[PDB]
Amino acid sequence: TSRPPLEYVKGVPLIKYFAEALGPLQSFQARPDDLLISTYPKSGTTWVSQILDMIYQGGDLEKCHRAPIFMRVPFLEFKAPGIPSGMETLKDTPAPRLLKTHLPLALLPQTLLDQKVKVVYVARNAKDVAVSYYHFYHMAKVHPEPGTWDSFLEKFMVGEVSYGSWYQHVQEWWELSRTHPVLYLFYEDMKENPKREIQKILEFVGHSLPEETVDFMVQHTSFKEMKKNPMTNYTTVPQEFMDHSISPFMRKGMAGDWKTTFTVAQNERFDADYAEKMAGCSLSFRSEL
Numbered sequence: 001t002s003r004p005p006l007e008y009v010k011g012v013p014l015i016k017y018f019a020e021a022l023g024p025l026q027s028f029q030a031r032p033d034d035l036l037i038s039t040y041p042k043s044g045t046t047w048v049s050q051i052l053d054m055i056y057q058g059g060d061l062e063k064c065h066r067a068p069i070f071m072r073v074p075f076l077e078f079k080a081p082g083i084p085s086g087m088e089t090l091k092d093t094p095a096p097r098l099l100k101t102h103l104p105l106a107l108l109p110q111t112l113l114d115q116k117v118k119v120v121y122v123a124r125n126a127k128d129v130a131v132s133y134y135h136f137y138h139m140a141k142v143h144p145e146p147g148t149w150d151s152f153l154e155k156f157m158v159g160e161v162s163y164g165s166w167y168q169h170v171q172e173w174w175e176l177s178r179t180h181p182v183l184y185l186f187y188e189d190m191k192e193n194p195k196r197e198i199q200k201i202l203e204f205v206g207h208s209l210p211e212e213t214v215d216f217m218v219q220h221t222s223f224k225e226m227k228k229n230p231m232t233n234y235t236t237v238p239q240e241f242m243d244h245s246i247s248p249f250m251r252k253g254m255a256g257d258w259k260t261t262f263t264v265a266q267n268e269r270f271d272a273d274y275a276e277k278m279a280g281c282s283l284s285f286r287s288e289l
């Protein structure tokens, strides 16, 4: 098998190479002017990464094409054979740095909280996440075999997928936001009103840009622009690692398209389980626009 099993670390199932990567990651030192992009997988990481990097380049799109987003925004825990690790990439990254992770809080380098690093967190509704992830598993060959949609959806509801439970991830980081600087966004809000969300990000990172530059960012962070941009669309990675003919990384970009995959039986079982897991939480997600 080329698709190795998940390895559990402190309760969290992880890609095996990412588990190994936690070793060198232990020596990682955060700076006070770092910013961390944190998400459960498939919730808009790449989207918000492109947004934050354009802001960092003061809107200059030629600066944003300097390299693929994975090299401009180092992925902390990342590693795979014949690809440079997130830690190796990080050492050539100039400050102020943007950093990406999907780690639950129980694996997050303590340095990031100690240093009070600003967090941009993005949450997305669980149903869209699930569908997105199922397809991602097929094209991104470091994951184990996804199986049928039905058996993947059952694993997703118990957290037996890479990075574990969606339900715990979005709650723990929601709770963290009351004691650490976290801007907590929803993919759906960004779909609804991208300009509004970008203005929130701007206020959060303490920058100012003219209306015209903001409007130029909305354009270049749209699904369509990001899909054809080879610096955001992951098409330059080796086909041994991601195969786009199986499923593109920039797949649909919709809120609400889970309706086209979930059967009615799956939906009813998912809803009942979801109300149990999310009962004590004050988060309200939108499943569609």
Ligand SMILES: Nc1ncnc2c1ncn2[C@@H]1O[C@H](COP(=O)(O)O)[C@@H](OP(=O)(O)O)[C@H]1O
Pocket (backbone or CB within 6 Å): 039, 040, 041, 042, 043, 044, 045, 046, 047, 128, 131, 132, 133, 135, 221, 222, 223, 224, 226, 249, 250, 251, 252, 253, 254
């Ligand atoms: N500019 C954009 N607008 C809306 N969705 C975007 C986007 N850029 C990427 N995405 C979507 O974000 C999801 C992947 O997120 P991550 O970057 O966290 O892996 C994919 O969702 P779909 O598979 O629903 O299309 C991808 O298509």
Ligand SMILES: N#Cc1cc2ccc(O)cc2oc1=O
Pocket (backbone or CB within 6 Å): 041, 045, 080, 102, 140, 141, 142, 143, 237, 241, 242
């Ligand atoms: N193989 C593989 C990959 C897994 C992966 C997991 C999470 C993520 O945010 C990005 C990723 O990019 C990859 O190329």
